[PDB]
């Protein structure tokens, strides 16, 4: 519960990985 | 040390993949355990991920080549072994250079398939 | 008459990590003293 309360090159990969998978979920939806 | 550890892990995974390839030839690809059905997948992406397009072959093969820096290589394979890229399609690693190429090709595949669905949904 | 020497080649200053006496004060400041040693090595490598 406390952990929930509290909250550059590698970021780009995370951004792309998240965004890449974002469309993969969207296509499944519709 | 990181380079040595990653290389040994890849070799060990590849060796295990060959052993599993013997068993999928016995009981079909379901009968092994869950662990040895995640090893096969990440080790069918390593094999596809080891291929690289050479710049010398641009004229003949057309596709632009890639020069993968050592730092990228260690990180790219290290992440795959852990399981971070367990959702990327297998074919995204075939004849691509670096982890970023894997991601961009995934965008081009996810977006490409998006048109196909709108077509197959329609018509 | 072959090559004599590369005058543009200096030896890299071999750094040495400062070692602190093993006392209770060192245990209390173990994190504090380690940072100083790292800073000293960084200064030696870069120069200042």
């Amino acid at each position: 519960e406390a952990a929930e309360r509290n909250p550059t090159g590698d970021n780009a990969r995370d951004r792309l990985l998240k965004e890449v998978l974002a469309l993969q979920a969207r296509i499944n939806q519709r | 040390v990181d380079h040595y550890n990653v290389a040994q892990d890849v070799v060990q995974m590849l060796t295990k993949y060959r052993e599993l390839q013997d068993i999928i030839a016995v009981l079909g690809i379901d009968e092994l355990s869950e662990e040895d059905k995640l090893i096969v997948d990440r080790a069918r992406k390593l094999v596809k991920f080891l291929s690289q397009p050479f710049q010398v072959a641009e004229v003949f093969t057309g596709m632009t080549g890639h020069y993968v820096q050592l730092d990228d290589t260690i990180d790219s394979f290290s992440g795959l072994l852990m399981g971070t890229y367990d959702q990327v399609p297998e074919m995204a690693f075939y004849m691509v250079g670096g982890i970023n190429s894997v991601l961009e090709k995934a965008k081009k595949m996810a977006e490409e398939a998006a048109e196909l669905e709108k077509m197959r949904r329609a018509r | 008459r072959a090559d004599e020497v590369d005058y543009t080649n200096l030896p890299a200053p071999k750094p040495q990590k400062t070692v602190w006496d093993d006392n209770i004060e060192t245990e209390v400041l173990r994190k504090y003293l380690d940072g100083l040693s790292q800073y000293d090595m960084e200064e030696a490598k870069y120069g200042v």
Partner: protein, 137 residues
């Protein structure tokens, strides 16, 4: 010939060290000997006037580089020509304070150690230790 050419390029900044180390009085002495200044000055005489002026200017700047940044900031405030005298006076003042603080015999031993650590000549150390003692009284 090669040594003088390399030294001239290095001082001019055209060619840096292998590790891009700063071109200090320390490093120049490291690779070109103790008397690099004398041989370079003699060699420079075989060069046009412009190159001779540059060599002289670079040599003077390198000599000023023989001090640390802190010493230059503290002592070179009133010009470089007066830097040496100001530094010597500051160095002498520190010796006087040490003598008044922890005696003379320990100071004599300390001066011997510092001269050993400074690569200083015995005559200079004796000249320095005598001057500080005279300044005390």
């Amino acid at each position: 010939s090669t040594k003088m050419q390399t030294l001239h390029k290095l001082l001019t900044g055209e060619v840096s060290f292998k590790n891009k180390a700063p071109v200090k009085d320390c490093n120049i002495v490291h690779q070109f000997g103790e008397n690099w200044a004398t041989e370079l000055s003699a060699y420079a005489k075989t060069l046009p006037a412009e190159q001779q002026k540059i060599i002289v200017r670079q040599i003077a700047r390198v000599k000023l580089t023989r001090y640390t940044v802190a010493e230059l900031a503290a002592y070179c405030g009133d010009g470089p020509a007066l830097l040496d005298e100001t530094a010597r006076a500051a160095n002498i003042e520190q010796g006087v304070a040490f003598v008044k603080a922890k005696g003379v015999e320990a100071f004599e031993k300390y001066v011997a150690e510092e001269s050993t650590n400074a690569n200083w000549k015995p005559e200079e150390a004796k000249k320095f230790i005598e001057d500080v003692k005279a300044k005390a009284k």
